[PDB]
């Protein structure tokens, strides 16, 4: 009801208590020792969670000042949840560390605006100079290391998703939740399918307990419920003097239709077999040009030059097998030409940019997996569904990695990197003696992620710090190992995207915010 | 309302308190001296229970952190009981000296991944050697003795138990039925039965009291409603020169069939029983080969080559006897070769194991019984309704002994097995001091369910273990009677499922509770 | 009545509020960096301080909690003022360690009477390693070096305090009295100088000062006031054929004796004047005797056997010359061998020696010093009242570092000798490892000294107090300049007496706390 504007420093009160009860909230549950929080839901039992985007959302409290605090710095970690999922806190440490070093130089009376300016050059010279110290990473050991550090420190989840990507290759596409049982159960979609079970139980065909797989078959396509006196009759008669299996793939089937081809086929007469519609309208249609481009059959409609009842032999697909059960069905090396792959290569090239972009290349990448690559989902099983939902959020994480590393490459990690990179920019210089200022500042701030994470090891940051301070190369503590020496050699590797994504989203928020002179509110 | 964030031991220290209240209501309630607990309920008067899940499920408490570590523990409790019924008070007690330990351990500061891993190595462990030690017993003398031990020591309801299982065989199903008088009664009635009766009263033969017996009955199988076609008679005449009864099963018939059919057995040509079909058009298609091989018969339906209109004498099943009644419809026996039941029995023992677990077992067991088995009645000689659900869960409780004592067996009770391997594994180590300790942990917290078994007699726990200690393999002391002597001897025996299940699932909320750091939350 | 019961933690959380109120409001003061503390006056103005000290002793806080951490904290702090002076906010931080790094210990659940025992072993070891280490001051520039650096750093009044005492001699009495301007002023007082100043005003001999110069007088010392004679012919006509002028010292005197001895001043026979004995009955008796013996003279006894009557030239006192004004009596010189002199002397100081320490003892030694050498007054003004307490503050630790440099000398300073001393600290071992773990807390609690001035500095305190470590005897790192290199060279040293007494009084003061495990106060 009531209303509070403040301004300045009064204001400026309010935000940093809120950010250091943020902080204290999140920065010290991240790493191995760092915990897990618990979110509460109404209905039923709270989520125990480290994921800081799934903590950023939950934050709600009394206070309105830490409340729109949250609200502001949630865009920024939702975007690198949205890039990397992991290290957050750092981004947001970061952010911390460089608003209390905002408020030295609004106490020293700088200009933010210029500070920020900066800060900002330095952050882009301190993206090109990471790109520089970016190492390929190309070896399934690698892959495993990077694997096991997303799952922190999980050398089963890696070596485990390593070996799957090894086996289903670089274009092996994921998408996984995990089933009732407590198995790790690899499964592999090879080619075309879809989950579909039979449209009647006569369904069974020559493999028993009504499995079904007809090899070199002809494949049909029906824009709608044929209708007429079973329809295709050329086409049916030319099967019927082929004797090869007979698929279908029907919009809908009359009812007489399904009764006579259950006495065509379990007479002995002619082997068809059909599937209902597989998808949505202009979706079924897309994966109807797909498939005929996959199997080098065209898509069988009255929509084309011809009409669907009398037309030629040839506008049906062809296939090496195809396999149709209760629960699915699939396509075994259909046989259609490179010319026409590589057509819908260019037409998946089109699209990958997208408007819409969220599950429209998710949708051109299920059709490449289902054209070259494959489906590769691994149930991982275990107790409580937080602890799969945590799986697969540490699962996802590590895929990402791994699409980061295969694009560009990994850079060292633990943050050894940051400070390499942050004594290697110390000289960079600007317009004036104010910005200088402000970029060593930002620099020496810059270190509280790495100093942060050694609190939570429960050990001292200052000896650590200044040691690596001290040490140059690829020298670096593993607190876990408790040692000194090469990280890269204890294969401790980052993505390039997640720290660069997250040091210019964190960077520029914080510059642009901490520059704030006034703030409206409203209390009870 | 207003939201608020704790941190750490203080809010781990609200929770122990309401988990301590928590335990302390489970305590009372098992065992022999285990007494029953009132819980009030709106909708009539409290309801006065001994089982774990009916009080776990009605848990409020008033404090918001006991009130949500409630919730989380009540999911291991939940699956408990999905799984086997009752041991949710061994997990209890297992949560609870488990949760001191972790609280001082954090009161030393100590590292808790490195505890999880030594939990679940000591788990792994102890898994493998409990597996090890399970012991081969199917006589059904020891069938006996489990149900009785899991009725309380009582000898009538395990006897009747037994008995059931024999009738209907190691595979068949026994189910439990509702009981109004003071004695319990098990009846066995064979072949498919349903609750129909026959649809005109007329239909009643001569026998009094509603009986209508066919001897020798032959089965006709209608995919439709084919009473308006009226063009049976061809068939049905054929059946009169055969001499026989035919009996319909139709998916419905109108008055005029009706009354033809009651004018003709009253004219004295046929005598005929009509009945609906049961069940769902999926349903009853599945049901319809079932009876056709109990019969000897094929699926007759209309949606194939062939069909009602022009069918042969032949094509209709052969049964010793139908019992038709107002209460239910029931074939006795059919008279068909048993190969394919057996087929399809296998078939579907591929169909068995599937994610979908609850709403389709139910269904799956009574098709397999019907198949294979005998229907299982049972009625209970308690007086009121919580001593109905009392003997009742008993009852299940009785019967998943029987099933986890069929495919793997049981061991020795009273947790026994348990102090005799953990003393042997007092050696156990993991990678670091931190795991070797942590497995120190459960070494000391498994004790817990032992000692609270023998407190539950009011009695110090120390003097039992002292000397269960110095004793070895099957010794033990017998609580309910309070002597000591030989564990097998005492005939108190523990199924492996359950145990196995038990500490997995404590392993896990181990895992998760130690995780825990913070919290936000509400207050009015 | 009120009751308020604490049990373990209970009462632990308070005591760790309380403990750390207390030391943020003790830590602000000391270093160079160190900043100035408010002790409200509700009547007049507060005092602007830097004693932690002089803030703890007088400040009392309100909240029940608060006030027992401040009770049991405040004896300690008390002593030391009543021993020390200063070290106060030093002896203040290592209790806070003690009992911070024992909660801990307690926390690990470790034996707390075996670490005390372990504690007391390690104080004591460490005091005979500080005797070890002592090494004396002689030279005056180190004294007025110590002088200083105790004075924090006021160089002018601690070279005009080192030069003052050597003035005095060693055994020369010091004290400090308020002046009127800015600037303090020494005063050598020599010979007998006492508060009495003249009656009637024709005793001016000297004019424009008051002051009455005698030719080696006559000087009488009377236990008795004249009242009933009138008549001193014995003394009077024996001073005539003297011709000398005469001092008359009495217990009191009477009008009559006024009125007599002024007219013989008006006579003009030989200078008269009389004074009154400074002080109560048994002080003045008890100057008479030391009066007579420097002045080789005899008092008058009225309690023993003589009188005026029997008079010669030793019964009546001499001194070479005198000194009287309207305010005190100054004698230059007396006629005294030293072997009485100091025999009286060494028989006062072997009643000196007793438990007494107060003000009639500390003029006692005033006492001496004007019979042996001299005696230092220092005269303190300032233009505020709060400057002149900074000044007093400041100019009673330099007199306690004199004190302790002319007793012993002092030792290594700033606590780097703590922690020299701590790095051979960790050979000693206990009866178990209890004891072992008590020791080594003497090795995790000797870093108060470091961690506070690096608090105070706000630099990195870990590598800092590593690299001094590194180094030995005179190197360390100046917080006044905040740069490492030798100490000594700018006599930066600690009395031994203080920092023995306070690091074991507070060890034992604070491990007596620290095994505290029920607290009982008052409810509102």
Same mark, same amino acid.
């Given at each position: 009801a009531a209303k509070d504007v403040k301004f300045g420093n009064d204001a400026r009160v309010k935000m940093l208590r809120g950010v250091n009860v943020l902080a204290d909230a999140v920065k010290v549950t991240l790493g191995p020792k760092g915990r897990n929080v618990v979110l509460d839901k109404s209905f039923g039992a709270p989520t125990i969670t480290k994921d800081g985007v799934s903590v950023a959302r939950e934050i709600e409290l009394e206070d309105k000042f830490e409340n729109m605090g949250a609200q502001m710095v949630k865009e920024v970690a939702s975007k690198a949840n949205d890039a990397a999922g992991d290290g957050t806190t750092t981004a947001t440490v970061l952010a911390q560390a460089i608003i209390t070093e905002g408020l030295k130089a609004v106490a020293?009376?700088?200009?933010?605006?210029?500070?920020?300016?900066?800060?900002?050059?330095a952050v882009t010279a301190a993206v090109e100079e990471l790109k520089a110290l970016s190492v390929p990473c190309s070896d399934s050991k690698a892959i495993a290391q990077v694997g096991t550090i997303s799952a922190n420190s999980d050398e089963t989840v890696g070596k485990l998703i390593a070996e799957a990507m090894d086996k289903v290759g670089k274009e092996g596409v994921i998408t996984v939740e995990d089933g009732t049982g407590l198995q790790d159960e690899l499964d592999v979609v090879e080619g075309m399918q879809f989950d579909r079970g039979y449209l009647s139980p006569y369904f069974?065909?020559?493999?028993?307990?009504?499995?079904?797989?007809?090899?070199?078959?002809?494949?049909?396509?029906?824009?709608?419920?044929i209708s007429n006196i079973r329809?295709?009759?050329?086409?049916?008669?030319?099967v019927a003097k082929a004797?090869?299996?007979?698929?279908?793939?029907?919009?809908?089937?009359?009812?007489?239709?399904?009764?006579?081809?259950? +006495?065509?086929?379990?007479? /002995?007469? %002619?082997? *068809?077999?059909? !599937?209902? @519609?597989?998808?949505?309208?202009?979706?079924?249609?897309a994966m109807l040009q797909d498939i005929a481009t996959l199997t080098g059959g065209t898509v069988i409609s009255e929509e084309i030059g011809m009409e669907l009842e009398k037309a030629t032999l040839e506008d049906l697909g062809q296939a090496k097998r195809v396999v149709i059960n209760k629960d699915?069905?699939?396509?075994?090396?259909?046989?259609?030409?490179?010319?026409?792959?590589?057509?819908?290569?260019?037409?998946?090239?089109?699209?990958?940019?997208?408007?819409?972009?969220?599950?429209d290349r998710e949708k051109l990448q299920?059709? +490449?997996?289902?054209?070259? /690559?494959? %489906?590769? *989902?691994?149930? !991982?099983? @275990?107790?409580?569904?937080?602890?799969?939902?945590?799986?697969?959020?540490?699962?996802?994480?590590?895929?990402?990695?791994?699409?980061?590393?295969?694009?560009?490459?990994?850079?060292?990690?633990?943050?050894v990197a940051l400070i390499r990179v942050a004594s290697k920019l110390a000289d960079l210089r600007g317009q004036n003696e104010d910005q200088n200022v402000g970029i060593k500042v930002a620099l020496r701030a810059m270190e509280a992620p790495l100093r942060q994470i050694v609190l939570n090891c429960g050990e001292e940051p200052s000896v650590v710090a200044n040691t690596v301070k001290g040490g140059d190369g690829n020298y670096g503590y593993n607190a876990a190992t408790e040692e000194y020496g090469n990280m890269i050699d204890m294969g401790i590797?980052?993505?390039?995207?997640?720290?660069?994504?997250?040091?210019?989203?964190?960077?520029?928020?914080?510059?642009?915010?901490?520059?704030?002179?006034?703030?409206?509110?409203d209390l009870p």
């Open positions: 020293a009376g700088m200009n933010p605006m210029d500070l920020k300016r900066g800060i900002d050059k069974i065909n020559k493999p028993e307990t009504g499995a079904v797989e007809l090899e070199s078959p002809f494949i049909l396509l029906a824009d709608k419920k329809e295709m009759l050329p086409v049916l008669e030319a004797g090869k299996p007979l698929l279908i793939i029907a919009e809908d089937v009359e009812g007489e239709a399904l009764a006579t081809l259950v +006495v065509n086929t379990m007479r /002995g007469i %002619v082997k *068809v077999a059909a !599937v209902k @519609a597989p998808g949505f309208g202009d979706r079924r249609k699915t069905t699939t396509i075994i090396d259909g046989v259609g030409e490179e010319a026409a792959i590589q057509g819908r290569v260019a037409q998946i090239r089109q699209q990958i940019e997208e408007a819409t972009s969220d599950y299920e059709r +490449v997996a289902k054209l070259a /690559g494959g %489906v590769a *989902v691994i149930k !991982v099983g @275990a107790a409580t569904e937080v602890e799969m939902k945590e799986k697969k959020a540490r699962v996802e994480d590590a895929l990402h990695a791994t699409r980061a590393a295969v694009e560009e490459g990994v850079v060292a990690g633990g943050g590797l980052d993505p390039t995207k997640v720290t660069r994504s997250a040091l210019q989203y964190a960077a520029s928020v914080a510059g642009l915010m901490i520059t704030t002179e006034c703030m409206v509110t």
